[PDB]
Amino acid sequence: GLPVLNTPGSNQYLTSDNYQSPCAIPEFDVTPPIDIPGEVKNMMELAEIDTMIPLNLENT
Amino acid sequence: GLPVLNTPGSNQYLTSDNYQSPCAIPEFDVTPPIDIPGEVKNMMELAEIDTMIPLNLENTKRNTMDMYRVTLSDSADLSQPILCFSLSPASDPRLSHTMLGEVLNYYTHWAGSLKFTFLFCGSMMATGKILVAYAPPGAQPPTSRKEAMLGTHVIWDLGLQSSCTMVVPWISNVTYRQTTQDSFTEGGYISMFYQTRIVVPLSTPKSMSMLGFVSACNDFSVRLLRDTTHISQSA
Amino acid sequence: GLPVLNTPGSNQYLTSDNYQSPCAIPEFDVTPPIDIPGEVKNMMELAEIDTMIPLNLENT
Amino acid sequence: QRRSRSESTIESFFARGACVAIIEVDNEEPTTRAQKLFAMWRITYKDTVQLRRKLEFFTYSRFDMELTFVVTANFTNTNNGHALNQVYQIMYIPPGAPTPKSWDDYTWQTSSNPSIFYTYGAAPARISVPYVGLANAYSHFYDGFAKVPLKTDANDQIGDSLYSAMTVDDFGVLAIRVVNDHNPTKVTSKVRIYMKPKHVRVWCPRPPRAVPYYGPGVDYKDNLNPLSEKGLTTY
Amino acid sequence: QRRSRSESTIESFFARGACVAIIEVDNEEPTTRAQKLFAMWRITYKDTVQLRRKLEFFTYSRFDMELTFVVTANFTNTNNGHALNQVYQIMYIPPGAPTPKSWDDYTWQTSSNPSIFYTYGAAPARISVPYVGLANAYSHFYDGFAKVPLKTDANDQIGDSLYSAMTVDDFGVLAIRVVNDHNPTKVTSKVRIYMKPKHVRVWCPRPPRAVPYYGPGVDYKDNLNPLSEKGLTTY
Amino acid sequence: INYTTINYYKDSASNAA
Amino acid sequence: INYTTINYYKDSASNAA
Amino acid sequence: INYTTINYYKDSASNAA
Amino acid sequence: INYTTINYYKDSASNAA
Amino acid sequence: INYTTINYYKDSASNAA
Amino acid sequence: RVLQLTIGNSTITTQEAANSVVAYGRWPEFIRDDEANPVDQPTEPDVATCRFYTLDTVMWGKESKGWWWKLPDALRDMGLFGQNMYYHYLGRSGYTVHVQCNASKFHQGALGVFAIPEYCLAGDSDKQRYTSYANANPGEKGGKFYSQFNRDTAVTSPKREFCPVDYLLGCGVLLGNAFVYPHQIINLRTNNSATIVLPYVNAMAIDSMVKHNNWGIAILPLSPLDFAQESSVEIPITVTIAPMCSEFNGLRNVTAPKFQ
């Protein structure tokens, strides 16, 4: 049919990968989203929120 | 030739897949189709067909011919309900084996407004009024007529016509309810009381009969096909 | 190289198939055909030839 | 409006592939008993219950096919000797073709019949079959006979037939054998055939079976009481 | 300016796939004990800690899925006899479907439920699941009940429920068994399920858990002293 | 966002849904 | 320098990030 | 509905029916 | 005589020399 | 009837006849 | 508004006219093939022979269970349609089953008239699909349903006949699920007639009539009959069938099957 050639790095399972993958439940009618307040678009809108630190950590 | 790289998920056999597959008998002259009447294009033209439910499932008359009809008469008590059943079209045993039930046991989620149609098959001279009522969940199931007239209800006459039509609306917090016996997504309650007593003249039978149906409107919809529990292969 | 994914039905040998297949003797000078009389283009020019049937099949 | 009715379509209702049979085939020294050196299976869908009860919502249908063969193996001794990797020959036989009789006949030359060689351990086999009917649709629930007993018959057995059957042998058999010669160590195999219809068009809906099946007919013997116990006026 | 803020995005924060369970399944002669011929696993994410504590920065979320099944095997005897290559059947079961009870029931025919056949030794299985919620988002930290005890109840157990739970059975189970028949040699298997969310949208941030978990609730029993010893004015 | 369907085999039953 | 993304499957959850 | 046939090999006998 | 280079992955370190 | 030759590798000795 | 329903020479008038269910929305017609190369014409008894034939009259008592017929099994006794069906090898037809059942204003009860395509009933003996011809085609006299399943035990003389159960409908389905067939309800409160037009439903374009039986009619009393106060009450039911748009093909010698 078509002369392919396998390269190294085949049949492994790398955890950080973005491959296509077959769906298990095809033809699925997904529930549409609504405008729930307070959407986080990035982790940096959690660090930039002003939070309190513990200072006096003496043993009592 | 070409440097391919295998990904995970190879050499498995997933059952729900749409791959190409080699034919075994090539160059085949297929018999052409003809216009056989009654083509089903979708499962929803089976649920929307109006079918009868079994109501009176007492132990003398369940699994018998007479489990479909409800005996209502002149000497019946006026404060007591005629028939009562929740709106759970796969877990309620009075609605599991209907055609609406036998389709919704294949699918997990469902939503849509479904309608009931009762049929009075007494004599011509018998009259009366019947209050059929629906109540959304959250409260106690209604016991007497005094607390069951508050919800959505239809006063149904027996003299002019011999059939009502009650379209139960779609009131739900979630988009899709389930086809299991669950308490988080409860359907509702259906009850039927005497508005007024049945009035029957002399030389007329006192014991009438009633048949109840069920359907689905044109907005009913289901998803997530799964197995069923209405069969058992005894091997 | 290229993220392929094997499907079921691989490594089998189905007898009725039309796959490409590598030649064993490449660069071959094929003998050209000539107009030999009576070419059969289809099995139906064998059934439509009028042939005799055996009728009297008694045991003698 | 705003409800995807795509999950309930006919081509999506038959998307899963359920088993139709399990075939034993063994590889031992040839005994005087019923040798399972080759095994045969009559092609039919009415062997299991979940695919049969699903197809019988519909009177007529036409659809392609996609079979899938999943093969396992075992040993019969604890520290049994090791054995090389085995090769199976699945073989289709149309109606009328010569049936194999021994392990190695003249008919395993597969000179006309399509056959699938499946090396054990690889991905499963996966072949497609087009619409092989001879009418315009497959006919579930044939009503009549095959033969009609005439008045001018000699005896009863000439005009004798079988109720609700179109042909004695529909669609032939599969004939699975193991290509490798037999060993003093024996390897028990169990082939499972899956089946996934494609391009499905159906006609004339009918209600589903609700007492357990019994044989390839439409009759019944046991468990004639499907509906459970439930009160009349209890929610 | 001139700092790529792309590594910290939500779709990049959930890029790794952590384990959610380890399932034992064994293949031995059927004993009188608790036979691990088939095993079941309730689908949940709150079994490990690293994926649970990561998802609970956020109150609501919606996201797809990509599972991955990694299967190992062992023997139980030193010079144990050799055995052929084995086939596993992972099987999904939606809520309400019939649960398997033996090794080989009528329910392993996978006629509706999606199931994955995984020959041992090949690349791992790798399937995707869409957003199967029924609200508009998955709800971490449900506050209320499922049932409300009324004044008109008979006893306490009718209106009884469980704090912070939406449904008793969320998303069903997996049901892993080994297709091959049992042997006098037994092979212990340990399936590990990985999970990698895709297309992640989250809402309403909340601070993370900082005492160790205890059960599927939000409560705590032990190690109530997270911060260590450190002086006030010491650098 | 779309995809690509290319029928590879000559037979009609070989195609996809 | 660029690349090529071709979505192969019909389902929405089957696609890549 | 159609398909795609691309001959890959140089030899004449290598092609498909 | 030439060839064809098609970068398949999104990451920069994934490419070829 | 023709075919398709696409050279995949950069090196000259890697090509086909 | 009163239907002067006339087909052929006979005429069905009425005292009440409400509806007329056309099964699956298709009125019957002949074979409509635009790709037909032969233009020769078959044998069509369609010039005056669309008549209403009338079957036997059954009596619906208080404890009667049901009736069932087959088509075109019920028409082999009478008419010139019964003669064309024997000389011709294959033919098709369409039907109008008209069921009238009168009662006074003081009776009650309700029948249900179904039309099941490919109506395979169930045998009684444990031998599977083991039913003789004469017992599986009772003719215009029909058959009756039963209360409980009583299988036969006589093994040297097996009965070789059906034993359908009414709430199983014979086939195996429930009765409340049996409204997906094209149906009609003779509610004795309002109406007293029921007409159902049946198209030709079969897999082939044209098929034999001696061996195959397309439609099956089943009349179930959904509610039991009751007069004023008595315990003995009998009203009659009469069925009427009209073969519409029939055609036949392929003459041969006559065939008389045995009916013991």
Author numbering:
A (entry chain 3), C (entry chain 3): 1 to 60
B (entry chain 3): 1 to 235
D (entry chain 1), E (entry chain 1): 66 to 300
F (entry chain 4), G (entry chain 4), H (entry chain 4), I (entry chain 4), J (entry chain 4): 25 to 41
K (entry chain 2): 12 to 271
Q: Mind quoting what the paper says about this structure?
A:
Poliovirus (PV), a member of the Picornaviridae, is the causative agent of poliomyelitis and destroys motor neurons in the central nervous system causing paralysis or even death. Genome-free (empty) PV particles, such as recombinantly expressed VLPs, do not undergo the final maturation cleavage of VP0 into VP2 and VP4, which rearranges the proteins on the inside of the virus capsid with a concomitant increase in particle stability. Therefore, to produce an effective vaccine from empty particles, it will be necessary to stabilize the particles to maintain the desired antigenic phenotype. To confirm the authenticity of the plant-expressed PV VLPs, we have determined structures of the stabilized plant-expressed PV3 SktSC8 sVLPs by cryo-EM in the absence and presence of the GPP3 pocket-binding compound.
The structure of the PV3 SktSC8 sVLP was solved to 3.6 Å resolution by cryo-EM and showed that the particle is very similar to that of wt PV3 Sabin strain, demonstrating that recombinant plant-expression of PV VLPs can produce authentic particles with the correct antigenic features. The overall architecture of the plant-expressed PV3 SktSC8 sVLP preserves all the structural features characteristic of native conformation particles including the canyon depression around the fivefold vertex of the capsid. The only significant changes are on the interior of the particle, where the N-terminal region of the uncleaved VP0 in the empty sVLPs is less well ordered than the corresponding regions of VP4 and VP2 in the mature virus (residues corresponding to VP2 1–11 and VP4 1–25 and 41–69 are not visible in the sVLPs). In addition, the N-terminus of VP1 from residues 1 to 65 is disordered in the sVLP structures; such disordering is commonly seen in empty particles although these are usually in the expanded C antigenic form. Although the pocket is “open” as expected for a structure with D antigenicity, very little density is observed for a pocket factor molecule in the VP1 protein for the PV3 SktSC8 sVLP structure at 3.6 Å resolution, although one or more pocket factors may be present at very low occupancy. However, it is likely that some VP1 pockets are occupied since the pocket has not collapsed (structure is native antigenicity) and some weak density is observed. It is likely that the VP1 pocket is partly occupied with a heterogeneous mixture of pocket factors, acquired from the plant cell expression system. The mutations are distributed evenly across the protomer, and are involved in either stabilizing the hydrophobic core of individual protomer subunits (VP1 T105N and VP3 L85F), increasing the hydrophobic packing between protomers within the pentamer of the VLP (VP2 L215M and VP3 H19Y), or, in one case (VP1 F132L), modulating the lining of the VP1 pocket where the pocket factor binds.
